[PDB]
């Protein structure tokens, strides 16, 4: 879920971003980016939770009425013009195990060093599974957070697919 | 807000591995280890002849390549098409039907020598 503070901040970011779409010009946006700031500072020191919830509740409706129908979206963000564009080139690392030895001989250094990562992952798995058992309640993991490695020489649990993930801008 | 001490520790430990992995993706100078080839003599000539990049160097190279392209992609194909049209297509009825040329008053027919009578004198006007 989201706490009351988080909604206020998330609403604050959305209002500025949609306001920046209505203004275009920086000087105009700056002028109205500070008037909107005052609308939050004015009620910043509120103490009544019930009143604060009402203010947020009415603020959201005021935002939905004034939102830009075509708000600016960063190209790589969900909904942008470059979102998921390079997924075509993201190839998983396991595809290299099927390479023909003729293709594998063109990169002797890369595959001699990729093998070391193979050994590190292979020798670190047992300790990986062992740590998760001892640091998990009897019922089961109640959250998706993963603990860091405790001892020295132990890699973080469940690290392979976060470390070896495809690059953001491949070929 | 803010990462808890365990969150910072994990993000930092993962960060070290990520950089080490990304570093290991860099090709060494030797790579790629291309196998032996069958380099042709014509290719050999142009490499040394064009290693200086002189303007009179590539001008010959540009003319040489365009002449080859014209011979193999325009002259050869048009030879084949003309042979096809002339001796195989145009030998069959109603294969290439040309709209008959326009005959205007005052013209001469190259095939019978007749002269088309001119038009009647225009009555009058200006502008």
């Amino acid at each position: 879920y989201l706490t009351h503070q988080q909604k206020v901040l998330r609403l604050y970011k959305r209002a500025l971003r949609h306001l920046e779409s209505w203004c275009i010009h920086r000087d105009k946006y700056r002028y109205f980016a500070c008037l909107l700031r005052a609308r939050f500072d004015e009620h910043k020191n509120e103490k009544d939770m019930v009143k604060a919830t009402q203010l947020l509740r009415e603020a959201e409706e005021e935002f939905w009425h004034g939102q830009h129908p075509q708000p600016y979206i960063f190209p790589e963000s969900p909904g942008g013009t470059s979102y998921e564009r390079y997924e075509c080139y993201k190839v998983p690392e396991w595809c290299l195990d099927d390479w023909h030895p003729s293709e594998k001989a063109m990169y002797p250094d890369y595959f001699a060093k990729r093998e070391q990562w193979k050994k590190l992952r292979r020798e670190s798995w047992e300790r990986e599974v062992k740590q998760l058992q001892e640091e998990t309640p009897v019922g089961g993991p109640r959250t998706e957070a993963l603990p860091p490695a405790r001892k020295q020489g132990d890699l973080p649990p469940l690290w392979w697919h976060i470390v070896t993930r495809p690059r953001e801008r491949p070929m | 807000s803010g990462y808890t001490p365990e969150e910072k520790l994990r993000l930092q430990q993962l960060r070290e591995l990520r950089r080490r992995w990304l570093k290991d993706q860099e090709l060494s100078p030797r790579e790629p280890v291309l196998p032996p080839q069958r380099v042709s003599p014509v290719e050999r000539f142009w490499n040394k002849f064009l290693q200086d990049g002189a303007l009179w160097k590539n001008v010959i190279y540009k003319t040489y390549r365009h002449s080859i392209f014209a011979f193999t992609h325009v002259l050869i194909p048009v030879w084949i098409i003309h042979y096809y049209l002339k001796y195989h297509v145009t030998t069959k009825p109603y294969t290439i039907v040309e709209k008959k040329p326009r005959i205007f008053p005052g013209d001469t027919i190259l095939e019978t020598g007749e002269v088309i009578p001119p038009m009647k004198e225009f009555p009058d006007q200006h502008h």
């Binding site: 190839v91 998983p92 690392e93 595809c95 290299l96 099927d98 390479w99 023909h100 003729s102 293709e103 990169y107 890369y110 495809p166 690059r167 491949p170 070929m171 | 993706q25 860099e26 090709l27 790579e31």
Partner: peptide
């Protein structure tokens, strides 16, 4: 600086 490109096997 000439990073390695992960591709599927094109030999076959």
């Amino acid at each position: 600086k000439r990073l390695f490109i992960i591709k599927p096997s094109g030999f076959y």
